[PDB]
Write a protein that holds these residues in place. Structure first.
Motif, PDB file in Angstrom:
ATOM      1  N   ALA A 242       0.819  -1.213   0.000  1.00  0.00           N
ATOM      2  CA  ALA A 242       0.000   0.000   0.000  1.00  0.00           C
ATOM      3  C   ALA A 242       0.848   1.257   0.000  1.00  0.00           C
ATOM      4  O   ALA A 242       1.935   1.278   0.578  1.00  0.00           O
ATOM      5  CB  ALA A 242      -0.949   0.040   1.201  1.00  0.00           C
ATOM      6  N   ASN A 244       0.587   5.635   0.607  1.00  0.00           N
ATOM      7  CA  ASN A 244      -0.233   6.584   1.322  1.00  0.00           C
ATOM      8  C   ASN A 244       0.467   7.922   1.402  1.00  0.00           C
ATOM      9  O   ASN A 244       1.599   7.989   1.836  1.00  0.00           O
ATOM     10  CB  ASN A 244      -0.530   5.980   2.706  1.00  0.00           C
ATOM     11  CG  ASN A 244      -1.478   6.793   3.561  1.00  0.00           C
ATOM     12  OD1 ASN A 244      -1.382   6.773   4.804  1.00  0.00           O
ATOM     13  ND2 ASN A 244      -2.405   7.491   2.945  1.00  0.00           N
ATOM     14  N   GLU A 250      -0.066  14.218  11.061  1.00  0.00           N
ATOM     15  CA  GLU A 250      -0.683  12.866  11.049  1.00  0.00           C
ATOM     16  C   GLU A 250       0.226  11.808  11.673  1.00  0.00           C
ATOM     17  O   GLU A 250       1.433  11.866  11.483  1.00  0.00           O
ATOM     18  CB  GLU A 250      -1.060  12.453   9.648  1.00  0.00           C
ATOM     19  CG  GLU A 250      -2.200  13.302   9.090  1.00  0.00           C
ATOM     20  CD  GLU A 250      -2.832  12.619   7.920  1.00  0.00           C
ATOM     21  OE1 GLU A 250      -2.750  13.148   6.784  1.00  0.00           O
ATOM     22  OE2 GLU A 250      -3.371  11.514   8.174  1.00  0.00           O
ATOM     23  N   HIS A 251      -0.361  10.848  12.405  1.00  0.00           N
ATOM     24  CA  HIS A 251       0.412   9.783  13.054  1.00  0.00           C
ATOM     25  C   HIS A 251       0.418   8.489  12.236  1.00  0.00           C
ATOM     26  O   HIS A 251      -0.414   8.317  11.341  1.00  0.00           O
ATOM     27  CB  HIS A 251      -0.075   9.573  14.481  1.00  0.00           C
ATOM     28  CG  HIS A 251       0.162  10.773  15.344  1.00  0.00           C
ATOM     29  ND1 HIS A 251      -0.587  11.932  15.224  1.00  0.00           N
ATOM     30  CD2 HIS A 251       1.093  11.022  16.294  1.00  0.00           C
ATOM     31  CE1 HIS A 251      -0.148  12.831  16.088  1.00  0.00           C
ATOM     32  NE2 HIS A 251       0.862  12.302  16.756  1.00  0.00           N
ATOM     33  N   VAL A 252       1.377   7.608  12.521  1.00  0.00           N
ATOM     34  CA  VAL A 252       1.441   6.333  11.805  1.00  0.00           C
ATOM     35  C   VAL A 252       1.548   5.177  12.788  1.00  0.00           C
ATOM     36  O   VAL A 252       2.374   5.214  13.731  1.00  0.00           O
ATOM     37  CB  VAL A 252       2.614   6.277  10.793  1.00  0.00           C
ATOM     38  CG1 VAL A 252       2.668   4.893  10.108  1.00  0.00           C
ATOM     39  CG2 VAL A 252       2.452   7.365   9.729  1.00  0.00           C
ATOM     40  N   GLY A 253       0.697   4.168  12.560  1.00  0.00           N
ATOM     41  CA  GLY A 253       0.771   2.864  13.247  1.00  0.00           C
ATOM     42  C   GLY A 253       0.048   2.733  14.578  1.00  0.00           C
ATOM     43  O   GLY A 253      -0.508   3.715  15.122  1.00  0.00           O
ATOM     44  N   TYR A 254       0.065   1.503  15.090  1.00  0.00           N
ATOM     45  CA  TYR A 254      -0.326   1.196  16.453  1.00  0.00           C
ATOM     46  C   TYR A 254       0.539   2.036  17.359  1.00  0.00           C
ATOM     47  O   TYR A 254       1.740   2.200  17.086  1.00  0.00           O
ATOM     48  CB  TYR A 254      -0.124  -0.303  16.813  1.00  0.00           C
ATOM     49  CG  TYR A 254      -1.177  -1.224  16.262  1.00  0.00           C
ATOM     50  CD1 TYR A 254      -2.514  -1.046  16.600  1.00  0.00           C
ATOM     51  CD2 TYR A 254      -0.846  -2.299  15.409  1.00  0.00           C
ATOM     52  CE1 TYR A 254      -3.511  -1.874  16.103  1.00  0.00           C
ATOM     53  CE2 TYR A 254      -1.850  -3.145  14.903  1.00  0.00           C
ATOM     54  CZ  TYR A 254      -3.179  -2.928  15.267  1.00  0.00           C
ATOM     55  OH  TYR A 254      -4.209  -3.708  14.803  1.00  0.00           O
ATOM     56  N   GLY A 255      -0.061   2.565  18.429  1.00  0.00           N
ATOM     57  CA  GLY A 255       0.653   3.464  19.337  1.00  0.00           C
ATOM     58  C   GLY A 255       0.784   4.933  18.894  1.00  0.00           C
ATOM     59  O   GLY A 255       1.140   5.809  19.720  1.00  0.00           O
ATOM     60  N   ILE A 268       3.329   0.705   2.964  1.00  0.00           N
ATOM     61  CA  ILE A 268       3.134  -0.412   3.838  1.00  0.00           C
ATOM     62  C   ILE A 268       3.787  -1.633   3.188  1.00  0.00           C
ATOM     63  O   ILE A 268       3.638  -1.902   1.978  1.00  0.00           O
ATOM     64  CB  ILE A 268       1.659  -0.654   4.170  1.00  0.00           C
ATOM     65  CG1 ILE A 268       0.999   0.626   4.687  1.00  0.00           C
ATOM     66  CG2 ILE A 268       1.528  -1.794   5.184  1.00  0.00           C
ATOM     67  CD1 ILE A 268       1.672   1.256   5.902  1.00  0.00           C
TER      68      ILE A 268
ATOM     69  N   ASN B 127      -9.400   3.841   6.520  1.00  0.00           N
ATOM     70  CA  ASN B 127      -8.253   4.454   7.185  1.00  0.00           C
ATOM     71  C   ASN B 127      -8.745   5.728   7.824  1.00  0.00           C
ATOM     72  O   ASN B 127      -9.031   6.706   7.107  1.00  0.00           O
ATOM     73  CB  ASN B 127      -7.132   4.748   6.182  1.00  0.00           C
ATOM     74  CG  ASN B 127      -6.012   5.563   6.788  1.00  0.00           C
ATOM     75  OD1 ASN B 127      -5.988   5.829   8.008  1.00  0.00           O
ATOM     76  ND2 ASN B 127      -5.078   5.971   5.963  1.00  0.00           N
ATOM     77  N   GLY B 129      -7.007   7.359  10.419  1.00  0.00           N
ATOM     78  CA  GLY B 129      -5.875   7.964  11.163  1.00  0.00           C
ATOM     79  C   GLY B 129      -4.816   7.007  11.657  1.00  0.00           C
ATOM     80  O   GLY B 129      -3.732   7.458  12.055  1.00  0.00           O
ATOM     81  N   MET B 130      -5.084   5.687  11.661  1.00  0.00           N
ATOM     82  CA  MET B 130      -3.979   4.766  11.926  1.00  0.00           C
ATOM     83  C   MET B 130      -2.925   4.875  10.827  1.00  0.00           C
ATOM     84  O   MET B 130      -1.761   4.669  11.094  1.00  0.00           O
ATOM     85  CB  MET B 130      -4.417   3.303  12.107  1.00  0.00           C
ATOM     86  CG  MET B 130      -3.255   2.423  12.613  1.00  0.00           C
ATOM     87  SD  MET B 130      -3.849   0.828  13.112  1.00  0.00           S
ATOM     88  CE  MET B 130      -2.400  -0.200  12.883  1.00  0.00           C
ATOM     89  N   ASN B 131      -3.345   5.191   9.594  1.00  0.00           N
ATOM     90  CA  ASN B 131      -2.432   5.377   8.446  1.00  0.00           C
ATOM     91  C   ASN B 131      -1.580   4.130   8.167  1.00  0.00           C
ATOM     92  O   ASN B 131      -0.321   4.145   8.066  1.00  0.00           O
ATOM     93  CB  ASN B 131      -1.574   6.638   8.608  1.00  0.00           C
ATOM     94  CG  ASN B 131      -2.324   7.887   8.226  1.00  0.00           C
ATOM     95  OD1 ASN B 131      -3.062   7.887   7.256  1.00  0.00           O
ATOM     96  ND2 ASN B 131      -2.123   8.976   8.977  1.00  0.00           N
ATOM     97  N   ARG B 132      -2.305   3.031   8.080  1.00  0.00           N
ATOM     98  CA  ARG B 132      -1.730   1.813   7.605  1.00  0.00           C
ATOM     99  C   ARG B 132      -2.528   1.454   6.340  1.00  0.00           C
ATOM    100  O   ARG B 132      -2.169   1.919   5.292  1.00  0.00           O
ATOM    101  CB  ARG B 132      -1.782   0.779   8.701  1.00  0.00           C
ATOM    102  CG  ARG B 132      -0.811  -0.340   8.445  1.00  0.00           C
ATOM    103  CD  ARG B 132      -0.705  -1.236   9.650  1.00  0.00           C
ATOM    104  NE  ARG B 132      -1.979  -1.929   9.887  1.00  0.00           N
ATOM    105  CZ  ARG B 132      -2.169  -2.812  10.859  1.00  0.00           C
ATOM    106  NH1 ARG B 132      -1.181  -3.116  11.698  1.00  0.00           N
ATOM    107  NH2 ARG B 132      -3.356  -3.383  10.994  1.00  0.00           N
ATOM    108  N   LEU B 133      -3.614   0.690   6.431  1.00  0.00           N
ATOM    109  CA  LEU B 133      -4.380   0.338   5.225  1.00  0.00           C
ATOM    110  C   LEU B 133      -5.701   1.043   5.279  1.00  0.00           C
ATOM    111  O   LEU B 133      -6.213   1.297   6.364  1.00  0.00           O
ATOM    112  CB  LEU B 133      -4.661  -1.166   5.201  1.00  0.00           C
ATOM    113  CG  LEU B 133      -3.440  -2.053   5.234  1.00  0.00           C
ATOM    114  CD1 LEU B 133      -3.904  -3.499   5.132  1.00  0.00           C
ATOM    115  CD2 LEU B 133      -2.408  -1.780   4.127  1.00  0.00           C
ATOM    116  N   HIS B 159      -9.726  -0.715  12.087  1.00  0.00           N
ATOM    117  CA  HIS B 159      -8.868  -1.113  13.206  1.00  0.00           C
ATOM    118  C   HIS B 159      -8.438   0.143  14.012  1.00  0.00           C
ATOM    119  O   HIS B 159      -8.013   1.148  13.441  1.00  0.00           O
ATOM    120  CB  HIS B 159      -7.617  -1.822  12.705  1.00  0.00           C
ATOM    121  N   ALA B 161      -5.959   2.169  16.296  1.00  0.00           N
ATOM    122  CA  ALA B 161      -4.528   2.297  16.504  1.00  0.00           C
ATOM    123  C   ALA B 161      -4.181   2.305  17.980  1.00  0.00           C
ATOM    124  O   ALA B 161      -3.092   1.839  18.324  1.00  0.00           O
ATOM    125  CB  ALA B 161      -4.013   3.593  15.889  1.00  0.00           C
TER     126      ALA B 161
END
Lengths: 356, 337
Positions: A242, A244, A250-255, A268, B127, B129-133, B159, B161
């Motif tokens: 992916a 983006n 803007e934030h990225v990912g878990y956490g 990704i 998506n 705001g997790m900014n993955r998929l 999902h 984040a």
């Protein structure tokens, strides 16, 4: 299909084995192939390492795998047997045993006639300070004396605790080993791991035991494989799944541990800790793509990672190197707060293995 | 033989799946079993989780494995398909696909007749705001309204984040999700992972997606499985192979070659017969050392690396990571009981 792949270069393995030969010209080589050839796959590595004089393994079962694969080389069980019922199997398969404590001594004497008739040496392990496995000084002298008098051919074996750095316990261990050697000569001897092969050719004696260097990773925190003239064997890859474009803030990912300080392009990638790519970093980590290094951003998840591709031309399907010849496994380790050995050993079964 | 063993408690799996039913009483449950069931072994977990309405996986291969093991439950490919040629197989095997970007939407439309005729939902990932998929708002509305028009049945999927913590992006994600659902209603919806199942029953909707909680590990850095009433599933063990008087030290037949983690930021422990004993010095590839000064042991005594008494999240915290990672990065060397 999802692309996550572990490539193993057979020519690099041959080359690094040849490096051992260049560094330890008058010693037999025990190639350490425990832990499924340090995660590189025994099926894929034994043929490339067939010029080895012996293969070293952590347990009987690893040795039985070698034999099942058709290989007839001498095999050394580097921790010896864990239960007495392994003795008949070891003897039948021609596996030489390390002994490191009284229990194994008793079992070996018990099976001495068959063991000796098979032509098998016994490797007698010294504890010279590590306090892991081995007989202490002076008990080891009596053990060796007794084995010799019982008809055994022995190999005095030690392992260095801190050969990878300058450390005072290295001298204590060298001197302990030479004292015992002198005291028990005439005797075969073995004490060099990869680090000691580079540092102390005077301690090569009869058998050296390279491990990590065979795999083209470094035994030293302060030396690269390029400095050492070793060839990385494993390349670990995945692909971009992916793309983006994100805005400042803007934030990225878990956490949400990563905040964009300018607008940027994120890709990704189809790898995560469920493949054995490590999760928790203590410094910034990078992947290798299109001849560049791209930072890993935000947290690593089970199945996916995010990379900053702002400066790098990519597409969906673009191949991404997690480690190999362009991003060195020991640099990834250092960012992960550990050592290359561990990264190589803790991959999951999800990636496809391909020999090259 | 060298002893290094992974045990999977089926009753614990069932218990935890029941905890899901208790906390998310009205939703269907997509049990997340990606990555070989978070390291636990799909062969030994699918049976125990047989009452699941569906199974979630990371890729087509993992779903094929589920079918090969005889399981006919619906399967969701939670990242969708990676190449177009996966679609006929997903269709044939009755795997529902997530779509998260334009490429997958195009491949799905291309296979619409067969996909719809097979009775397969499309899970459209947001998506927020997790900014993955995921598709973004408003672009996702267009996708959904087109798919509805083509006769597909959709699931709006998202999902969180930061469901494990208090965090304002949780509210942002919630409000975006509800806004999209309102615009696209009526529409099936799915957004809860383990943390969300614990915290936000109001967001359960039609499908909840428990992962870590099934395995009896914690989705929350600040909560134990006892606090959460979950039963540890995996017990990871080895045995004492040597004893030394230096303290009394026992050497144990596990190392990082087995998947026992090497690098610690603070003191770690094992459990022997329920009692904690410190790990001392460094973890090698094949061995660790433990302080047994206060503890009566023998050669061959079984040592718990993690399980019910030494919790995997505690080991993980001492290793600077989380339980999920430890469960996932075991080698082939230990025997799976």
């Amino acid at each position: 299909m999802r692309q996550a792949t572990v490539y193993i270069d057979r020519q690099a393995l041959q080359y690094n084995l040849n490096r051992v030969k260049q560094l330890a010209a008058n010693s037999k080589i025990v190639s350490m192939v425990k832990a499924n050839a340090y995660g590189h796959g025994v099926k894929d590595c034994l043929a490339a390492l067939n010029a080895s004089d012996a293969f070293g393994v952590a347990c009987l079962q690893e040795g039985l795998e070698i034999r099942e694969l058709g290989f007839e080389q001498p095999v050394t069980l580097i921790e010896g047997v864990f239960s007495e019922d392994e003795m008949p199997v070891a003897i039948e398969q021609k596996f030489e045993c390390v002994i490191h404590h009284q229990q194994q001594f008793e079992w070996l004497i018990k099976h001495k006639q068959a063991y000796i008739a098979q032509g098998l040496k016994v490797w007698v392990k010294l504890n010279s300070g590590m306090n892991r496995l081995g007989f202490k000084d002076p008990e080891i002298i009596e053990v060796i004396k007794t084995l010799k008098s019982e008809g055994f051919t022995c190999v005095l074996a030690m392992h260095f605790a801190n050969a990878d750095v300058d450390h005072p316990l290295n001298e204590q261990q060298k001197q302990q080993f030479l004292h015992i050697k002198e005291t028990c000569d005439p005797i075969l001897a073995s004490c060099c791991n990869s680090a000691a092969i580079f540092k102390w050719p005077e301690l090569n004696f009869d058998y050296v035991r390279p491990g990590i260097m065979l795999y083209g990773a470094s035994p030293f925190a302060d030396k690269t494989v390029h400095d050492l003239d070793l060839k990385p064997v494993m390349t670990f890859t995945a692909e971009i799944i992916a793309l983006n474009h994100i805005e400042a803030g803007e934030h990225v990912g878990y956490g949400s541990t990563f905040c964009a300080q300018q607008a940027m392009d994120i890709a990704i990638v189809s790898i995560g800790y469920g493949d054995g790519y490590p999760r928790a970093y203590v410094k910034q980590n990078f992947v290798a793509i299109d001849g560049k290094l791209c930072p890993v951003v935000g947290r690593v998840s089970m199945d996916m990672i995010a990379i900053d591709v702002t400066n790098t031309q990519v597409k969906l399907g673009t191949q991404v190197e997690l480690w190999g010849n362009h991003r060195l496994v020991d640099d990834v380790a250092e960012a992960n707060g550990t050592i290359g050995y561990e990264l190589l050993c803790r991959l999951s079964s999800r990636p496809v293995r391909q020999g090259t």
